[PDB]
Design a binder for this molecule. Structure first.
Ligand SMILES: Nc1nc2c(ncn2[C@@H]2O[C@H](COP(=O)(O)OP(=O)(O)O)[C@@H](O)[C@H]2O)c(=O)[nH]1
Ligand SMILES: [K+]
Ligand SMILES: [K+]
Ligand SMILES: [K+]
Ligand SMILES: [Mg+2]
Length: 152
């Protein structure tokens, strides 16, 4: 698949679980894989699987974001809807402000519709509409991939 979509985010936001829900090729996931979702044919990257080589935590999360800004056509910025906006999320956001490329914000661990309102805190990151998802329950994936593919 021609467009490249990269998932970026701090640890424990659900990146590998979403990669495995979406990816064709079966660390916790294959890192780089073809993917197909209906009419969408693309390559997917879980940048959280890229070992940066003995660097501090914050440097590793910023460097994963930088690799996405280099490699990808569209970035999925993933955050944890049960934890709010953390400083580490703010640090990833500050890196992603440097790109012109489309960033779609995905708020994961929203395990049923009653949790949707947890998205409103994440408008503060400055990437527009947060998309609620659950990788374990398989929720919101079509809506997320439609927003990503709008950019193709
Ligand atoms: N409640 C909940 N837990 C999830 C969800 N997605 C992932 N998890 C769990 O959160 C943990 C971290 O998930 P993982 O995909 O490895 O996150 P990563 O560190 O961002 O790659 C694991 O225990 C997952 O099973 C979700 O949608 N809801
Ligand atoms: K529900
Ligand atoms: K769906
Ligand atoms: K384009
Ligand atoms: Mg992972």
């Amino acid at each position: 698949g021609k467009p490249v979509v990269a998932i970026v985010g701090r640890p424990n936001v659900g990146k590998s679980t979403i990669f495995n829900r979406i990816a064709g090729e079966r660390t916790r996931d294959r890192i780089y894989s073809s993917a197909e979702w209906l009419n969408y044919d693309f390559n997917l990257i879980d940048t959280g699987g890229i070992d940066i080589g003995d660097e501090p935590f914050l440097a590793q999360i910023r460097q994963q974001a930088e690799i996405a800004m280099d490699e990808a056509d569209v970035i999925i910025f993933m955050v944890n809807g049960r934890e709010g906006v953390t400083a580490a999320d703010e640090e990833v956001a500050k890196i992603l402000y440097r790109t012109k490329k489309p960033v779609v914000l995905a708020v994961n661990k929203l395990d049923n519709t009653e949790m949707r309102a947890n998205i409103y805190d994440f408008y503060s990151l400055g990437f527009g509409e947060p998309y609620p998802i659950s990788g374990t329950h398989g929720l919101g994936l079509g809506d997320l991939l439609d927003a990503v593919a709008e950019h193709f």
